Amino acid sequence: GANPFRPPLAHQGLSKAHVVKTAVSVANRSAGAEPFVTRNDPRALAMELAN
């Protein structure tokens, strides 16, 4: 039948076109930035009383 079983030729494989289960998309949540409420107390200022 021209159908031998010996050849280990396992082809190339199979292309996974899609996945059975879709991947949900979560909302991106960043974090602190340059003015991320930090303590530095350089000046402490001086508020003169007007009256």
Partner: protein
Amino acid sequence: VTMSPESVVAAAGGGNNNSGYNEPQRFALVVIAVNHNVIRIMNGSMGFPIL
């Protein structure tokens, strides 16, 4: 303020049992006032401009 005869007779003790004024009663007057004020927020500091 003008006080009451009940107060002036409760100040003296000598009351019978379970009368409350078995001992002489001392009183104190307290006065509280509620007022408005102005707060200014600027340059990362706060204070009372009017004071």
